[PDB]
Enzyme design. Structure first.
Site, PDB file in Angstrom:
ATOM      1  N   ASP A  56       4.022   2.099   7.691  1.00  0.00           N
ATOM      2  CA  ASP A  56       2.917   0.997   7.459  1.00  0.00           C
ATOM      3  C   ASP A  56       3.516  -0.115   6.686  1.00  0.00           C
ATOM      4  O   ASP A  56       2.503  -1.003   6.134  1.00  0.00           O
ATOM      5  CB  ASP A  56       1.644   1.520   6.900  1.00  0.00           C
ATOM      6  CG  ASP A  56       0.725   2.323   8.127  1.00  0.00           C
ATOM      7  OD1 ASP A  56       1.192   2.354   9.336  1.00  0.00           O
ATOM      8  OD2 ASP A  56      -0.269   2.057   7.886  1.00  0.00           O
ATOM      9  N   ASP A  64       0.917  -1.194  -0.055  1.00  0.00           N
ATOM     10  CA  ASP A  64      -0.068   0.007   0.241  1.00  0.00           C
ATOM     11  C   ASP A  64       0.705   1.415   0.085  1.00  0.00           C
ATOM     12  O   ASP A  64       0.721   2.247   0.955  1.00  0.00           O
ATOM     13  CB  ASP A  64      -1.098   0.185   1.171  1.00  0.00           C
ATOM     14  CG  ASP A  64      -2.048   1.184   0.994  1.00  0.00           C
ATOM     15  OD1 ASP A  64      -2.435   1.453  -0.215  1.00  0.00           O
ATOM     16  OD2 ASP A  64      -2.824   1.656   1.824  1.00  0.00           O
ATOM     17  N   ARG A  92       0.176   9.160   0.965  1.00  0.00           N
ATOM     18  CA  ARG A  92      -0.453   9.072   2.496  1.00  0.00           C
ATOM     19  C   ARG A  92       0.241   8.378   3.685  1.00  0.00           C
ATOM     20  O   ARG A  92       0.343   8.530   4.399  1.00  0.00           O
ATOM     21  CB  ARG A  92      -1.925   8.589   2.394  1.00  0.00           C
ATOM     22  CG  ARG A  92      -2.113   7.170   1.817  1.00  0.00           C
ATOM     23  CD  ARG A  92      -3.487   6.503   1.824  1.00  0.00           C
ATOM     24  NE  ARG A  92      -3.424   5.293   1.263  1.00  0.00           N
ATOM     25  CZ  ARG A  92      -4.187   4.897  -0.024  1.00  0.00           C
ATOM     26  NH1 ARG A  92      -4.556   6.321  -0.673  1.00  0.00           N
ATOM     27  NH2 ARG A  92      -4.156   3.807  -0.734  1.00  0.00           N
ATOM     28  N   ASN A  93       0.949   7.301   3.006  1.00  0.00           N
ATOM     29  CA  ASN A  93       1.817   6.353   3.640  1.00  0.00           C
ATOM     30  C   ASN A  93       3.273   6.783   3.692  1.00  0.00           C
ATOM     31  O   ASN A  93       4.087   5.916   3.905  1.00  0.00           O
ATOM     32  CB  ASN A  93       1.518   4.918   3.330  1.00  0.00           C
ATOM     33  CG  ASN A  93       0.237   4.642   3.635  1.00  0.00           C
ATOM     34  OD1 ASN A  93      -0.439   4.945   4.902  1.00  0.00           O
ATOM     35  ND2 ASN A  93      -0.441   3.947   2.808  1.00  0.00           N
TER      36      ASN A  93
HETATM   37  O1  LIG Z   1       0.000  20.759  10.294  1.00  0.00           O
HETATM   38  C1  LIG Z   1       0.783  20.374  10.569  1.00  0.00           C
HETATM   39  N1  LIG Z   1       1.010  18.784  10.976  1.00  0.00           N
HETATM   40  C2  LIG Z   1       2.215  18.195  10.688  1.00  0.00           C
HETATM   41  C3  LIG Z   1       2.400  17.024  11.964  1.00  0.00           C
HETATM   42  N2  LIG Z   1       1.326  16.066  11.443  1.00  0.00           N
HETATM   43  C4  LIG Z   1       1.500  14.537  11.981  1.00  0.00           C
HETATM   44  C5  LIG Z   1       0.156  13.907  11.950  1.00  0.00           C
HETATM   45  C6  LIG Z   1       0.311  12.591  12.220  1.00  0.00           C
HETATM   46  C7  LIG Z   1       1.333  11.877  12.517  1.00  0.00           C
HETATM   47  C8  LIG Z   1       1.764  10.303  12.851  1.00  0.00           C
HETATM   48  C9  LIG Z   1       2.912   9.584  12.945  1.00  0.00           C
HETATM   49  C10 LIG Z   1       4.256   9.992  13.248  1.00  0.00           C
HETATM   50  O2  LIG Z   1       4.811  10.916  13.648  1.00  0.00           O
HETATM   51  N3  LIG Z   1       5.242   8.944  13.130  1.00  0.00           N
HETATM   52  C11 LIG Z   1       4.349   7.668  12.832  1.00  0.00           C
HETATM   53  C12 LIG Z   1       4.733   6.408  12.421  1.00  0.00           C
HETATM   54  C13 LIG Z   1       3.853   5.580  12.373  1.00  0.00           C
HETATM   55  C14 LIG Z   1       2.339   5.756  12.159  1.00  0.00           C
HETATM   56  C15 LIG Z   1       2.052   7.224  12.249  1.00  0.00           C
HETATM   57  C16 LIG Z   1       2.966   8.116  12.681  1.00  0.00           C
HETATM   58  C17 LIG Z   1       2.846  12.536  12.472  1.00  0.00           C
HETATM   59  C18 LIG Z   1       2.713  14.183  12.206  1.00  0.00           C
HETATM   60  C19 LIG Z   1      -0.262  16.571  11.610  1.00  0.00           C
HETATM   61  C20 LIG Z   1      -0.227  18.192  10.693  1.00  0.00           C
END
Ligand SMILES: O=CN1CCN(c2ccc(CC3C(=O)Nc4ccccc43)cc2)CC1
Length: 278
Positions: free
Chosen positions: A157, A139, A143-144
């Site tokens: 992911d 996937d 987005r990922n």
């Molecule tokens: O407007 C500014 N912002 C910037 C940061 N953002 C944001 C949103 C979600 C995440 C999740 C995130 C992360 O930082 N690391 C990681 C590893 C695995 C899965 C998900 C994650 C990290 C950063 C939300 C919006």
């Protein structure tokens, strides 16, 4: 119930749980002795089932075997004893690549052509490593891919647990998109996932980069997509994209899996193009 792993265990009192990022929460880890590191913590919800716990454990064990690389979300540690399992992963302060690209479109600072090609190169690099470690993403999309405070592209992911024979094709993403729009025909129609279908997905990801967050096939539903794919349809060249880069996308979307370039090749090409990119 969970087995202890001295290689990754961090005391619970070292993880200061903060604001939810999306369940994944932002947090600060003390140590990793007197310094705090902003990290992302993955956890289960109250209404979760043992299956959900299974999957979460699977993603962690998967990250352990794969090893580290600058362009993938790396495992930092874990809290598995006497409480809720916490999987501590790298934090990406700028969110996913799609949003990052959209938020820099001209009417936040705009990105240069070199910046964009550089984005592609780093993603090809994360994938080259994952492929070399025998891992199929299944996937890959903007987005990922997460962006760190330093603008480092990190694939996310990749260790996710999934039942390909249980994928709801009529399901939109949180932003309201259809994931089937990133799947190779063989993966979509025949459920055959390989490093090659991932390459098809990389071509779609490239398209998003050069459209700065563009949505693939707007207004096209599952059923009509099948038909486009069967007819061998290919999206048009993004404006402000060289013929060279569009050719790359087209090469990634080769009908025959064996004829698509590998990530190793893509990395060489993009590395060459970046340097030639003003
Ligand atoms: O407007 C500014 N912002 C910037 C940061 N953002 C944001 C949103 C979600 C995440 C999740 C995130 C992360 O930082 N690391 C990681 C590893 C695995 C899965 C998900 C994650 C990290 C950063 C939300 C919006």
């Amino acid at each position: 119930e969970l087995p202890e792993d001295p290689r990754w265990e961090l005391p619970r009192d070292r993880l200061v749980l903060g604001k939810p990022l999306g369940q994944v929460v932002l947090a600060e880890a003390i140590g990793l002795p007197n310094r705090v590191t902003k990290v992302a913590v993955k956890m289960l919800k109250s209404d979760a089932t043992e299956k959900d716990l299974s999957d979460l454990i699977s993603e962690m064990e998967m990250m352990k075997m794969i090893g580290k690389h600058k362009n993938i979300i790396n495992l930092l540690g874990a809290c598995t004893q006497d409480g809720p399992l916490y999987v501590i992963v790298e934090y990406a302060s700028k969110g996913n690549l799609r949003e990052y690209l959209q938020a820099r479109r001209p009417p936040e600072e705009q990105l240069s052509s070199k910046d964009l090609v550089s984005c592609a190169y780093q993603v090809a690099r994360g994938m080259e490593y994952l492929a070399s470690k025998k891992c199929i993403h299944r996937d890959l999309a903007a987005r990922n891919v997460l962006v760190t405070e330093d603008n480092v592209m990190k694939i996310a992911d990749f260790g996710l647990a999934r039942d390909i024979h249980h994928i709801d094709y009529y399901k939109k993403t949180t932003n309201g998109r259809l994931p089937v729009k990133w799947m190779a025909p063989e993966a979509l129609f025949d459920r055959i996932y390989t490093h090659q279908s991932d390459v098809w997905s990389f071509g779609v990801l490239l398209w998003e980069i050069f459209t700065l967050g563009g949505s693939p096939y707007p207004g096209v539903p599952v059923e009509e997509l099948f038909k486009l794919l069967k007819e061998g349809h290919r999206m048009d060249k993004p404006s402000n994209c060289t013929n060279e880069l569009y050719m790359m996308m087209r090469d990634c979307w080769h009908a025959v899996p064996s004829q698509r370039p590998t990530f190793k090749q893509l990395v060489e090409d993009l590395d060459r193009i970046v340097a030639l990119t003003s």
